[model samples]
Target: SKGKLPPVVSSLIPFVGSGLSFAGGPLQYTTDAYKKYGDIFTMKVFGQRLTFLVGPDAHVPFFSQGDAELSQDEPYQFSVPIFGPNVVYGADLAHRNQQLKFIAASLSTKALQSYVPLIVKEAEDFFAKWDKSGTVDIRDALAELIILTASRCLMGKEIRENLFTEVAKLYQTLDEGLLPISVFFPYLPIPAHKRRDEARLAMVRMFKKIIDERRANPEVKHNDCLQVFMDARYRGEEQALNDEEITGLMIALLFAGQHTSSVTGSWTGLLLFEANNKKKFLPGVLEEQEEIRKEFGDELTMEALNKMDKLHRCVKEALRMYPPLLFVMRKVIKPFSYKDYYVPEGDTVFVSPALSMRVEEVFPNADQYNPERFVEEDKQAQKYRFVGFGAGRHGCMGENFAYLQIKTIWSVLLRNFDIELVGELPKPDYTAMVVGPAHPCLLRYTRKH
Candidate 1:
């Protein structure tokens, strides 16, 4: 009886239990339960009881535990419709591992080294397109730029030079379908769902055609991540990835990096400008940018950006405050026990970096936006406390790629303009599956030098 299941945080409504509160303020709801129910508690929503594990002690296992006891596949079936079949969550664990392993290689240092110029070019071209003076919706601009940058680098030359805008537009329909509702009624006869399916078909066809074109002409060389994927295969196997699998992996990688990078980049602006202590923070950030200007001498190279530790910490700190993917969940495949609690098979388990990183017990002055926390000798030692990009085997493969993407864009902006946040710090728009700042996150800018 001592190691029984975790106690439920009961809700009044049957089946719709705590849905509104969870939807409205997930962090608040979880925090309140942590106070009342201690470290772990189950909340019923739409007839499903999700067991939430709070803090670093819980996060380590939630991330490191074996696929035998816990499964990542079932929990993310919502992504299947969006990413397509036989890749990522659509496949068995072994197959998904191969897919990810393939991706991990595609994002290798050599590969990323090659991507630097393309990434820098996109950042320059995107900002250059702006009129150099008026108010701009920072979130919208970043959302588009991140996707464009990602497409050009990862999705291949055709996607970059030819179908870039078309692919970005198609991704919207896929994005619209990825709501909390998709976890339940993913196949509903709704407009968004319909568009998602249609978009999936069209996008797959487009990618398959590209793959076919490449296959038809092995002589015509390609220089992009998609080409890397096209050539990838499981260890010791001759057969390369098929078109369906390639398209699915491409979608998953694009969305994962694009959504998270865009939001974090947007937050970099909001916090550096709108924080109450902007006088204290903004000057430090600008000094770092200026230091890069003097040293790098107008070249935004991969090696140059990597040396900008302050720039690195700024993005790291923003992620600490507002991790775009609030939580990572795993469904129980085999019964497992944690301390006195036993989780039965079929239950879904959650670990939230967004919640744990904000725990004042671990992080002093946790709620504050302070990039210096990442640099302090004592705080830097507790790397596990900042699981913004997650930890262990299933950690985000594109982690370095994200930092480079965010830093490159931010570096270019800071170097070229004197940008100002147009208004107050924007609140989190939790309506998005990958939450970002709410609308009208405006910025005004003019060329600085």
Candidate 2:
């Protein structure tokens, strides 16, 4: 029991409340609410009371809170349909922790060391199919590339080498079903939802078949993340990962990195190609890439990738400006107080790094895209300043690998070709599970090397 409840906004409609407005432009709505209500306030969204936390200080407890006080699954129940019942968020806290451990093991440095070359190979092979000179949709192109790249690193060599196209289509179908409406009614009688179920079943069958085949032939191993997951040991047991769990984890890993990487990659290219921006950063990037190529040759080794600090900053800025998922929601399971306000159990808390990242106070002239902001010495000491990949106990685990994948893919592109945007940068689309540049993410490119 909390003492005092946070201030609640009055709704014109009784049950619907702020649901419509919140759904319309969630980031904008949260920003406006923060302006009016300061750091803490409450509003009923679709008959559910949600508390919004805008304080940078709030980042601590909000993210680090124990599962007893807060549960990730309730707020993220929408993921069940996409990731399946055996996956992390679909299970209990302990089980979820087990799942996280398995994922961490899968993404271990040893695995990533092997993955870098595979990612480079996929990037080369995929981009080799691109026309030497033409206009292209950055979103679509990157979407295909990321699936190919992620499947290679996370799923394994056989899937990437032999079953990529069919696997990618299954992934695409699941992604399409992750809509705003799905959050409220995931199993609604809708076309996307129907395809979503079909895809999940098909994917489960495919992954299970692969898992069975691998299990039958234990001598065959690829040293990939899938193998890591398969060999994971837990609680005095061996061969701990089951077929369903492996399939679920596979989908989760692919879904986790795919959209975020694709969108950020698209934004990176778009920002570099901005014509109105009279910045000479493009040449600087090219200089760095050229220097790296001269020193390291054509192969994009981890060492060469690490040397591109300029491109690293650019990617960070893109992530800051347009994070894949603009906001994160957590369900409050225990009563808690912030400053003078009290939030009770059964209520949800909303935090928007998308809005926070663009605040003038947090980021001076925040709307402008400036990679140098991330390069400054003063910036390094800043905490909770950039919440693109989030912070605290549940901070994005895939971030390191995501950076490697994006950097590897983009480095190859920048090293061999000159890319320019075909149109002005597009606005963010909020309808999808992960936010991305709206349609018509166009770019024109020509081989420069």
Candidate 3:
């Protein structure tokens, strides 16, 4: 009996035994996991027994523990293929601490202020196209929209102006890589991987060409993130990034900033279109959009955007219902107790915002799709409870930047066309890397006064 496994102290239900429930389904499966297994249970995931932690209090013990002890690297080690090695995040205590500090310090409010106009301009361009399509697929439209803004931000006007479409098309391969299988054993070189490699090459080729052009032109200013990084300085000395480093870093940010924002915006559009069915709610969104415009001169600055409290809540509710990163895995470095069981090190810890947000104690009328829950007038006034863009030190850095982009899209949408949902919304298509509308979220739109 030496090889026989030790017994779990908590309730036992094999998580993988639930079949694909953990992968594609909504909030219920995770809540069920908690119910069947208590705060902690050891369950099999792809042939290993992993510890499960549920709820704010229990989840917080680990999540709030910072990256120093319970590190992102414990579970997020699989992400190097996308985020690149070490990321702005390096290994060990001292270097990672400093690297994170540098990353945080470099993201100046001043620099982000410069980003607002470009975000707004890109949003307007996207609306110009969407307004023309009376009943368009909101998901497809949003993907195109976010890509343009992402391109503009990453490359600025010159590269995006000339090559946005081709770049976006190549980037489309990432959209294809979102299959549930891809998350499990993605090393098999699925069609998704091919697309990813192709897109990556195209992106590299484009950035390399710009680097060469910058070298040749004596007066050429390398603009956008690529240039900003090349010329970066901390206390006034040159912070020169060599060629390969520059390419890796630019591509890294592009990967992070693009699809995540795209999926989030797509969900917002769907929620907006859905709210049209309710006269009581959706109008408040439009009213606030106008109020922000009238107050801010139709521009989306970080200052201007902070004023629109209602839309901020609305985005949180939508994100609560449909978080793009369905699961976060943390590998235990040491055995930890949860409920009645202690899970050993090397076990995967699966935390679900998709499920966690739905607890009735945390969110009132949890399933009813109420954005008002996030309003300042509500009890849960702080942003930490929302958990949309994530939390703790690893929380999203470009959060304000993303908000500026979303506000830009809404500004144009509210002014030009009124959208009508075609029928009951279909389940989101989990076929790609980012969560997508089951069929691009069909809607009929017309010019509105």
Candidate 4:
């Protein structure tokens, strides 16, 4: 029907294909492949053929195609168990889009403004517990703090105050379910899968009780995402989301933002405090915080947070380099063609943000951590190139909330302590589904007089 299939990269093992090589580092594997094979190429892994769309121009169809042509449901089926049924990937395209719309509404600008104070307070209170001068694993600390802040802002004050520790443990068990094996065999009767189901059921029970109380006592107001979902109604049918849907959506929201924000936050800290970047970037970031502090006087407002261009760019740079989800995959439903290359139906299509963002021709000295690159006009003018949070139809809805959350945490840290990297900067750990800085991401912090 089309010109021809994209050239398949040779693999040593027949059925195993390039699984071993790609498993080492998908970013490295794909980057090297793109150099040799040009923009589009096919590689078989685990007996499955995966076609990768590498550069920005090549990514247009990958991100721009309609759901009927290229569906995300199959590639991300692993999330259905973790997020529960009747929500997210479990639902059909129409319903999934509706759920996404509700998610977007919950994270609107007005809602984000309200979260600033709650997030800032959580960061300040969490960090206040640290000793005056000590080394702490930045990844572990940010992971814990992110859950608490997300609970406070998204799950509401009840869970944050009463059921936090228990819920946090459940979330940890649930997150463990997302291993590489789970991608192909999502419902495998393994220990992690069993624990995941148990944790999900436990969370559903907890959320149902909270939802019941709120519905029974409507006068008691909650200004959080739970309240938003409960009040949300479908546009045409005027049908409100059921309790099951609400519970599933809540889990989905946490799954979407929690690890990504925490890991990105960890990387931001490591990058800003790197020996090479400290003299060049850290001072400007601190200067911006000082200006904001002078204006707001120890309070972080939405307006003050908006003025943090240098810190925001640093976070942006971190995301560009080590995006948590290294490859965004879609299932090709309709036979799609891109410039004479045919992508057969039922084939898996992937677009790598991590690889595309580091193209030497597109981004000069691409590996260097320079926030100033984002400062110049037209540097990142190309659409779909800087896809830290993705682009087009399914771009991350939690983006503003993530930026607000991370910026708030760093702003508080900068004002309260003088920070330094405790060890050689950690490398990206790709073993997990969501990549982050390898552990022992230690940082030294001394309280500022």
Candidate 5:
């Protein structure tokens, strides 16, 4: 070897090396490995060599390398069935970038600001039906509302008004289909995979109907992500996107935005309402809401939403503590060297936001849920250190939208209810693809007059 390979953590078994140990808890396992093996290390799991790039400095090559050097397509091929073909992981890199650009345009500053009232309206409408007081699984409640809001704001009124329940059920099937096994065998001839395919087709048909109607009647106007996609054209292409492309992109948008927002939304609430932090931090969040209400009146505005810096930090802190995607992975396509280590082609390289954000050296008292850490001081001033939305060329395009959605949901909840965690704060559920507070994450709330 031209350069020495990264140190590999020793394991007891041969093919099953580090499999059981890593399953214990990836965050703790990776952190312990980093302590013993320095910033870069490798651990084998079921014959696969997974390399860990710890800390911001070590993440330079991991995040900075071009797709030709380290491709994401192979590892994320599982998404093809869920997002449909010719989009996302299924598309070529150039095509994917164009689609991502369309996504960015739809979530731009002006577009996000316009979405404030829509998101606020969704939250208000959702909670208005709640009884005076009851125990609710915060995770379930947020998951449903996130989809509803996403459908309304992104999927257009056709789906939001009439097809919501059906679409929601189908989305669940698609979500459930993304099992750990599906990561390796996405199109396996299993019940969940079968249902996932059926659900995707059903959604595509729904979108086709809506698209046909819109084409027939050009006078009717709609303001949503769907319209943006419909209007978008690939560079050097004369025609707007076809129905298949638009629908595929729509599914991809929901896939990206819905799960992550719901998970973060649930965590933000749980973290804020945890018994110890409730008295200490909840008031500041509530106080900011009151101040914004006074400044902007009953209707929430993007200006008001942006002004809730205390609340924003709370969400950021929650994301740092339990990022939805704990590990952002890439498949090495061309060999690369970092310092004294050589990474060969086909190796899986990982950069963990869950571990990196909690590094003791960068974040003092890293275990504590201290939103103030992000206040004023740039504790995560180093590039790639705070990568809840990832970093570099592939950073999440939905970062602003996620913040706005979660913030709007919380603003409404905190303003309208006195809420408390129903039990000890639930642990992070790592089994799911998008991590969230574990099941039975209950919260008790009373509607305020």
Candidate 6:
């Protein structure tokens, strides 16, 4: 209910193109808005209040206060078009919390280690596919790669390998809730809207099919997150997770996990990879990763993967500079105070890791790409200062596993072949459901001579 009052003409212009650019365009938009508005202001983005809280002290304390108050109330409303009104996670409060925790536990080191073989196998398959393509787009390429990874990793190897692509088509429908159109015209149908409906139906059918097949004769014996759900017990009464329950988990990961990882993967290449900048940090990242390889031998075990110190630092910086989720939206549930200004419940607050990473105070010369910022002794980038995976309770559960996933894939790829960019420096695709390259963001690899 509270926001800035801009000139009438400012509101009249194409706010979508112009207004959004301020929020997502350059490194300076958030800073500029903060300077002009002084931490509390409003701008109509696709015609909704865009409230923000900048600075390390202010932003950190705000989001850390309470989950019940500042919960994921926003994304829930935003995802209705894809999951439908009656789906599992969308059902009730208890169901949603259980779902989040289930997904979180699945990404744990113990659980994730079990999927390492699957991840490596998938990465190898991706390179082979790329070898056949000859020329590739990092933007779209990363997206498709993660879809395969998420399928096999999150949905269990057999189920995902079988029907992952068919389910992936609905990811866009999951995104329809994010656009200006969904907020603008809630019921009207557009090409993306109509496509979403079709995708959801296809996904629903696929989810049910897999559940039935697995019950008859599960191809694998390992108890994955899906299996845990299928055996879930509520109040001593065994409440089996239905087909829709399993599908919700898979669909959630496919749409959310793949979408975020793919973009961040592309940006990792984009920022640290300009020819002139390659000699700066890329070599160090590779050298350290090799150390891990030597220590682990041919098998990249889970514990061995964690010792990938240098590569993990580099990936951390990449995440800091170009986060998959540059900004996070949360509603102010209870009254929260940040030194001077206080945000009451029901207010939407925006926090940007991308912008925060750029702040000089938060990150010394924050704009620079320095992996050492993470591992160097006495050099602590403020805890909330560089939250590429968020901070506190709501911080990403997949972060630990994500580090291994990203570093291992790149470590193998970069050493064996040289990746070269095809054209202009790529820009972030803010218009997307998640982040990625706007244009082709092309690249090709040649075996290291």
Candidate 1 lDDT over 1-449, as tens digits, reads 58987888853422232123127547887888887887778876566768888887766557777777777765666677788878888888778888888888878898899999999999999989877578888789888888888888888888778998789888887887776667655566788888998998888899988888889999997668788888887778788887778888888987788878899999887887774657777787778777877987778898788888877877888888988988777777887777788877767788777888888877789888888876673445444677888877788889999899899988888888887778788899877667789998998889875
Q: Which pairs of residues collide in model 6?
A: 4-42
In model 6, the runs with Cα more than 4 Å from the true position are 1-27, 36-50, 86-89, 129-134, 170-178, 183-191, 218-220, 377-382
Segments in model 2 whose C-alpha atoms lie over 4 Å from true places: 1-22, 189-191, 236-239, 377-379
Number of clashes found in candidate 2: 0
lDDT by residue (tens digit), candidate 2, 103-138? 988787777788888888888888888787998888
Report the Cα RMSD per candidate. 6.4, 6.3, 6.4, 6.5, 6.5, 6.1
| Residue pairs with clashing backbones, model 1 | none
State every prediction's TM-score relative to the real structure.
0.91, 0.90, 0.82, 0.92, 0.92, 0.85
Pitting candidate 2 against candidate 6, the one with the higher lDDT is 2
Taking the tens digit of each residue's C-alpha lDDT, what string does model 3 give over 60-122? Answer: 545665653454653433334443334443245654454444444334566667667777777
Residue 60 lDDT (model 4): 88
Q: For candidate 4, lDDT tens digit of each residue in 91-185? A: 98778888888889889998887888899889989989988899989899999999999889889999999999999998989888877677656
lDDT agreement with native, every candidate: 0.80, 0.79, 0.62, 0.84, 0.84, 0.65
The count of residue-pair clashes in candidate 4 stands at: 0
Residue 418's lDDT in candidate 2: 80
Give the clashing residue pairs of candidate 3, or none. Answer: 134-445, 178-432, 178-433
Off by over 4 Å in 1: 1-22, 45-47, 235-238, 377-383
Model 4 accuracy (lDDT, Cα) = 0.84
User: What local lDDT score does residue 84 receive in model 5, on the 0 to 100 scale?
Assistant: 86
What's model 5's TM-score? Answer: 0.92
